[PDB]
Every structure is written in structure tokens, then in C-alpha cells.
Amino acid sequence: VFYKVTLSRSLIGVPHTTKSIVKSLGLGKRGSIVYKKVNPAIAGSLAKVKELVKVEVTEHELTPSQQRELRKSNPGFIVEKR
Amino acid sequence: GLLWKIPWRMSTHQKTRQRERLRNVDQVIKQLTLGLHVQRCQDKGLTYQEAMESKKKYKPRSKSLRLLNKPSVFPKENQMSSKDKYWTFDKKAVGYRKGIHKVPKWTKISIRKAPKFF
RNA sequence: AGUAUGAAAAUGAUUAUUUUAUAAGCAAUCAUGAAUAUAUUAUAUUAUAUUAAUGAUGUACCUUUUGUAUAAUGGGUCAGCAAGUAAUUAAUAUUAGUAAAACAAUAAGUUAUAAAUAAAUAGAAUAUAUAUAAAAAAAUAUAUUAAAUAUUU
RNA sequence: UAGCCUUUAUAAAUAAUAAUUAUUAUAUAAUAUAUUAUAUAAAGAAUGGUACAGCAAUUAAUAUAUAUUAGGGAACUAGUUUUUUAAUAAUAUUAAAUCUCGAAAUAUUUAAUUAUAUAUAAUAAAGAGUCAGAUUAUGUGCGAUAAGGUAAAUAAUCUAAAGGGAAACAGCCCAGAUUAAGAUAUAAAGUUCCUAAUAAAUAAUAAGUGAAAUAAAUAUUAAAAU
RNA sequence: UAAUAUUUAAAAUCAAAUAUAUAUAUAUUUGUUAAUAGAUAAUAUACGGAUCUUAAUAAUAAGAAUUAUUUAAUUCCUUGGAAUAUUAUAUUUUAAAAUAUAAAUACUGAAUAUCUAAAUAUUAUUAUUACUAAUAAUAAUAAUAUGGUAAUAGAACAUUUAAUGAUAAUAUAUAUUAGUUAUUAAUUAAUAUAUGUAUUAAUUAAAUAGAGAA
RNA sequence: GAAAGAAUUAAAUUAAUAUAAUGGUAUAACUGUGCGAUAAUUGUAACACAAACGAGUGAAACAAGUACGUAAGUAUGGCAUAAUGAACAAAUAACACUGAUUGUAAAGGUUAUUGAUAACGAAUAAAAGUUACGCUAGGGAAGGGUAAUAUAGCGAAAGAGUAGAUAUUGUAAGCUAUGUUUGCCACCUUCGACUCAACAUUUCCUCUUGGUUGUAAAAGCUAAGAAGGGUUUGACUGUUCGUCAAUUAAAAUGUUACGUGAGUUGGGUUAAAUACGAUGUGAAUCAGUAUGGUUCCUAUCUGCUGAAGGAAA
Ligand SMILES: [Mg+2]
Ligand SMILES: [Mg+2]
Ligand SMILES: [Mg+2]
């Protein structure tokens, strides 16, 4: 099992301890998404910054590349070279 | 002196937003707990779906999470009172109360349990 | 204050295009009609350029400040001139030359090649051996140093 | 000078940051009244004396047809009773910057584990700038629980931060602008028009109360509950 | 049920909900007044302003823009489904009735995030081009980063002088206008003025090397 | 069942601690006693705490000697935290370290010790005033905030009022409003007179009204509405103010940079002269007194008073 953790609020204006925590969590920027293995420590960490973060449990994680692929919009065209 | 035009009440919209935020916080906690439970299940020797199904879901052991789960310490939004969603206990106000929206970073800060009689 | 030349700007008059006599504020930016000008591919239902219909947005610039639209400093405009340089040294770095030597090679000298001590006639085999200092018969103890089939630092 | 910043680099380098495990008890199961495993509860290794809470000791305050110690006044024949005066004792109640017997959270903080390595720490060789800060919120001292006052503490922002909101706005609320583009999520704030965007439900208000800066004691009128 | 004297309470009590064994018990959570007066100064009313409180008879139609508690039609069960209702549309049937469909994801809102391209730097993968090829140049893919005063670091351009140096009046230099290249610069075309013509391109060396701030 | 011993438990604690306050302390550091005057000794001190540096603090261990102790051991002064001062220049001893031609010396050094810079990181061995005759560089390293005081108002009502709190009065305490006083803060660097006034209402007069054993009337007192009109001339003083005089229906209180100095004046008031009193040794000084005594401006824009031209009627 994995947590999908998103930074939904900016760290700007938040006490430095909390910023540090967020950094540790591997969350770089607002809207950034991380997939973390579920162990108690991680959960505890997340609890502390709960008001900054949106979490959801998922079956499997995703590599950044996969995520990117998922994101990509549908280009509504098929090229043909002539 | 310098005019900080901030009202003593909140607009309905603001209140709604606050409520939503509260709900979201609760949801995060719930999700965390769920994740922990499913991890436990997996450790024991079950599938993901099976874990999800399970009647006897495991409570969390870590202190903080447990405390959060307790509604005495950290109420959920439906449980919570009107008087605590939109006001905090101020030790130096008139009525010993103050609109939450006055609290510095109220949009990030969580603060549910005011004192028992205040 | 040489002689030529001079479509450099600020500044004045005038003419053309355009906008302007019910409209209010750094005079711009973005949106957006209309009018005019030019264009040897405007084929046009064209393209550029100019122009304060009209709408939205928009507290000059510097300085000094906790902080300036400030009714704090400074400037009438334009043109020209106006401010981190040199000498003699020292220490670090980078690259090049040479290298257990380097520079200079007339002889000197400078730095490196041995650490230490106020100074003195003292001074180097994994360290637990050794060197110097305080101490001492000699060790210990403290500090710093040197020391590991080979080719010295 | 240290603190905060930068450049180059070093490694028998993960030391850095964050959390978790660590304790106590209950139930169940298994081994020898003990040990392990699983579950559950408990503000859950160690450090602490603020809030709160308390009146113990210390320092203060109150009340007794209570008890004792003496005194003042009083009756009858020095003894006696009552009315007390103060002190001490008893019982009850109370508070405090320099009282804490109970006692939080936040905090300091340890080893291992997990996560952060396009990451953090340490060290080496070089450089700086800064040493009249401001506001907001919280807990204070000074002031008069005055000040856009003053002095420090903690956090943020401003300083050095443009953007959206707060009518206008350094310091508030959100959010950190490499350059565009403008389809999709949105933050704080809003949705009759000005002005981008709205429809509902249940109550209350009749004063324009109120509608982004709440003015007090008190009085009147009504409404509920007993 | 009238009058009667307080209180403005969910602590207690009752009701409802959630968690534990569970039709009960235990523990936790939530639910208890409103007007008016009091009310007040000097350029001008001062919610930012307009303005906002609804009503039969009639509108394919308004009904707070205030205060309190809420929702994203309303109700139930556990994001979903169902029912109910509403609106809109279509078709059939006699302006109605029946059938089917859709809507129920409220919306706006930043220079936030994503998408969509572009630039730069770094880390990790490539592809092409050319004999520290373990390199360089260019192009991809994934990721992270790109506000900034004092300050530190790195890289360029303009101007002028010295070293080297082709070329040419169809050339050059300077100017104006319109183009071009991610553009303090240079280049293209037309035009005007020089000038028998670069201290010209480029690499070095240097600087009286860049001005709205005295 | 008794005696004795060993004790143990409770209370220990504000006694005592060389000395303030705090923390500690009976397992005693507190007290008594034997021995001893020795650890109130000598070289190396790692490593910590603390910390800008200079400094400070605890301290294991190694070596040399000493004291007490049967022994284990304990002692590098004091139960802990204050009890202090750099370098430089002098001075005294030890060291055998250099000895400017050599030898001696002198002089310097090493080790140990001495006296102070209390403005206590100490500018020199050695240092006070005044300037209104002053000058240079700079900085700002009445308004705004507050409302303690002031004024004004309310709520409650002790008490006055020939009786009776509430006609009229209204202690001390309460709750407010104003920003007209005296202050506080440090964002920011002139009083009067004349002229002209504009605005406010918490109304002095005039208009309407309620209460008034304290409205017989007339005069009043007090309160509500009301800002339309009006609200003074002299002697004194620089005065605003204030004391009088004469009037008046009344001679209200403010705000306007305590309105108005690019509109006037300059009497007061912060310069140069001089004098008096006071203070100072003196230069000089003053919450003193007195005579004299210095700024100017043609109006660009806003605005206002008038007067035209253009214009879309
Ligand atoms: Mg403001
Ligand atoms: Mg500004
Ligand atoms: Mg000027």
C-alpha cells in the first residue's frame, strides 16, 4: 500500500519546524505529489502537517514518468507525412 | 492608528470555507488511519481488497494518530459545535471569545477544542 | 578662440495627417472602432505606420529610510565632461614553465627541503617505535611532528 | 569578533532534517505464579515545575452563643455568672512575580529503524554585507490591562516580495513573477448593478437594526424555561 | 388552564448522534432569548456607492442585498445507488395526460498547480554531427531549480587604443525609415551625405571603457 | 513473661551552614571528638561545560612527594554559586638560557612574586568651565496617537430641600462621550490686536412646549423641540483672559494649522548694546526685571470676485 500525498497549501507563512517536516516528507513545491510507502513513521509525519496536505491511500505507487504520462493531455490529431 | 479593516464576524461564504477545511483535515486523518490499517492487514497476510473489506479494522498505535482519532481531543466537523468552528477562546477579549478568522494563519492552523466552560 | 563639415539634441515658427469645445488625475500599457499614409505578389474580405472615439488597468524617477504618491532629498531641458586607478610589498586561489628542487645564474640571495623551543652544544625505524618542548635516572603523561623487491617528500 | 550569507573543494561520510519504536496496563493464545506473540486502552524512554489546579508548609485574609489564656464591666454572700476585649487553639472558607504537596500541551532531548540524496551535516581554503529595524498574533515588564508608547520572548510577513483579496492599504488573509500561452484544477476572498460569478432550505429580525472597522453601565418592551 | 416569583442554563437533566460488548449498558459528542432606548460637533449624506425588508387581483416573471444554522434539488440506505420532486426537451395521445431523454458534477476567482510550447542550469537516460570521442557542439525524454535590497559568484555586449589582417565607389562609414535574428547588439532593403576607402572580420593585449541622479 | 542489646519505622528541615539570596544537606555537607597541621604540595593535564576573542568552570589519567586511615580509600583549600583587573614600564628573587671582537660584566630572556587602571577590555605619567559674537559637517537617529487629568452626560441614590431621596439639589464610589484644558508618546522639524469671517450646537437672547407643597400673578428655577435672526462700547493691562464702568432682549460655548502675518500690525515673546537683582572664583548665566532693537516677494496652477471671446442651437 502507498500514500499519495499532495501539498495543497503553500509553506509560505508556516513555522519553520513545519517547513522542515514538509521538506523531509519529500514535498518540494505546492501541488507536488509524492507516493510514500505506508509505515507508522510516515503516517505520524503526515499527521503533523495534515492542514497543509491532501492524502489518499492507493494500491500501487507511480514513478514520476508514469505520473507525467497520465497527466499529458490528448492531442486531438493524428499526423500523416506527405 | 493604522486601519486594519477586519470584521468581528465572518461572512457566510467564509464560514462555509472554514467548514470545508475542517472536513478536509478530518478526511486526511481518516485516510492515514485507513492506510495504516491496510498495511497492518498486509503484514498479517491479506490482499488489499480483503483488507479494505475486513470488519475488524485495526486502530493505530502511534500516540498522535490515536489522539487525533479520539473525538474528545480532536472533534470531527459534524460533531463540532457552531461556537467552536467560528470562534476561539481569547483570554483577553470581551466575552472571552474571538472570531477564528482573527487567528494569525487560521487557514492552516487547526484549533477545535476550546476550554470546557469558556 | 584652428579649418572644413554638420538631418545631434534641447528650443521657436509653420504646414500636413489625425484626435479634440458634457469632459477631471504620472499622460503610459493592454483592449478596440474609425480616419489617413505607404507598399512593383493589396489575389483581398490585404499588411504595416501614424492618430488622446471608446473601455480596462496604472500613486513619476532617484536618494535615505522601520517605512515615501508623499506635503522628506535631489534634479528647468538637452549636448559634452564628471567617480575603485598606480607604485612597493604580503597572503590566498587558477593556469602555465620547471620540479626535490624553483627563480637568478657574475657572485650572491629568496623560498622549499624538519619538526620543536624564549634560548641553548638538542633533532625522525603503525605506534604501543621516534623527534622536540616542560619533567626526568629512564620511561609515563600533554602538544605538535616525522616513520608502512622500491624509485625519497 | 561571533551570529546570519557566498564561492571552490574533501571523505574508509549519513553524521543532517522529520517521524516512528522504546513505557504502563488490560484481554486472548502459547511455553516455563513468570516469558513470548497478537489485540486493545492510556497525552506512552529520559529531562522539567509554567498554565491550570491547590492552600500543605511559608507569607496574607475572613467567620465562630466552639475551646483555652488573662483583662474590663456586673450580680449575690475573695468566691461567681454573664457580657465582652485581645491572643492562641479548633472547625470551615479564601490568594501569591519573587508559595508549588498535584500538574498539561507545547518544549529540550537519546539509540536504532524508516523516509528525505538532483538532499542535509561536518570540515578545509578564500570572500562579504549586517550590528537605529517595523507590524501582526500569542504570553509578559514598565505605563493607567492608555498610546501608531516603551522594553525584551516566541512565530510569521515586511525589510529585500511582484500577483489575488482586505474600498484605498509595507507589516492582515492567501500566494512566491525564468518566458509565454490561456484549456483544466483551484487558494484567500466573493456571486442584484457598479464588478469576474448563485441557486436553495429552515428559523429570527421591522430597527434601514444591519449590509468588511460590533459603544458601556443601565432602563423599557416582549420571548422562552422552571 | 389563569395568575404567581425567579432564571436566560445541555453542568445536571432530556433529546439526538458516534465509538466500545450491543434491541441494553458504558464512554464521548452536539442542542437553551430578541427588539428599542442609552447613541453626541464642527468643509458634506458617508454600508465604497446605487441601493436592499414585497403584495392579493395577473404576469412563460419579483419575494433580503440583514442576522443565525446549513445544502449544492428533497428524502433514505452505504463516493455510490434508489426513490420523490422540479425544470427543460423530444414523441405519442385527448391547452392537458402518458413514455423516454438530460440536468443534478453550483460558479467566479491569482503571475498558485496542471496542460500547452520556449529559455537557461544541474542530475540521470538517449539520438545526430566531428578524429579529457570517458570530449565538444546541437537535438530529445524524465526530474528538480530559475522574486530579490546589502552582498558573493559566473558569462557576455557597446566604445577607444596596440599587435596580426584579406577585401572594395556593385565598396564603406554615419544617419532616417521599414523589415530580420529570443534583439543594451548586429544585420537586410530603400533613401541622403561622405570617402579612392576600414586598426574592418576574428584572437589577444589593454583602457580617461558605458551616466536622469553629486 | 521480664531485662538488656541491636535497631527499625515515623517525623525529619528550616535549627545549623564563615557571609546576601537561591539550590542543596540527617546517607548529613550540620554538630562532637582522635590523630593531624598535612592536599590552603610539585611537573604533564586529555576531555567536556561555557564561550566572539581575552578570559571562566568541572575534571579523568600519568608521574614526584605528604597527611589521616586496620583497611577500602580520602584529601590539588572552604556544601555550591560572589570575594575581582590585560598588556606596557618598574622592582625582588631563583634559572644557566644568550652574552654584539674574546673573557668577565651589563643588558635581555625563562620561571616565581609585587603594587592599578571602580568610567572595573584599562586612550596619556599628566587636564576644568563658558559663548545670547560664534562658526562647519550632519541629524532631526503646533500636527498624529492616548485620554491619566479636564469638560460633558448618563445609571444607581447617601444626604440637603419648614414635611419628603428624585420642584430644585446629588458626597465618595460606577458606566460612558468629547479631544475645547494640564499631561504622556516621539510617526513627523508664536501670543495678542486689526480685517474678513465660514462652520458647529453641548442655545445667551428671541419662537413653541413639559415639570415646578418649591407654577396665585409677575419675575424665576429646571427640562424638551429649535441654529431663522441676533449676540457691546469704554478705563486698566502686550495680554486672550480678568477687575470694574455704562449699556443691552442677549452680552452663549466652541471648531476652522488654539481660522485668518505671499491680508495689516509687531505691543508680548527666544539674537547682537546696556543696566539692576540673584548664581558663579571667572568667562558668563536666569521658569528674573527693565530701555532699545531686521526679513521680503511683480501670483505659474488650484480657488474665489468680476468681465469677455469661441462654442453644438
Ligand atoms: Mg489598512
Ligand atoms: Mg505607498
Ligand atoms: Mg528643486
Ligand SMILES: [Mg+2]
Ligand atoms: Mg564579520
Ligand SMILES: [Mg+2]
Ligand atoms: Mg513564574
Ligand SMILES: [Mg+2]
Ligand atoms: Mg552600533
Ligand SMILES: [Mg+2]
Ligand atoms: Mg513601536
Ligand SMILES: [Mg+2]
Ligand atoms: Mg534597509
Ligand SMILES: [Mg+2]
Ligand atoms: Mg505584496
Ligand SMILES: [Mg+2]
Ligand atoms: Mg522571505
Ligand SMILES: [Mg+2]
Ligand atoms: Mg519563483
Ligand SMILES: [Mg+2]
Ligand atoms: Mg445602516
Ligand SMILES: [Mg+2]
Ligand atoms: Mg460599521
Ligand SMILES: [Mg+2]
Ligand atoms: Mg458624516
Ligand SMILES: [Mg+2]
Ligand atoms: Mg461593502
Ligand SMILES: [Mg+2]
Ligand atoms: Mg508558475
Ligand SMILES: [Mg+2]
Ligand atoms: Mg535570481
Ligand SMILES: [Mg+2]
Ligand atoms: Mg568615464
Ligand SMILES: [Mg+2]
Ligand atoms: Mg549625458
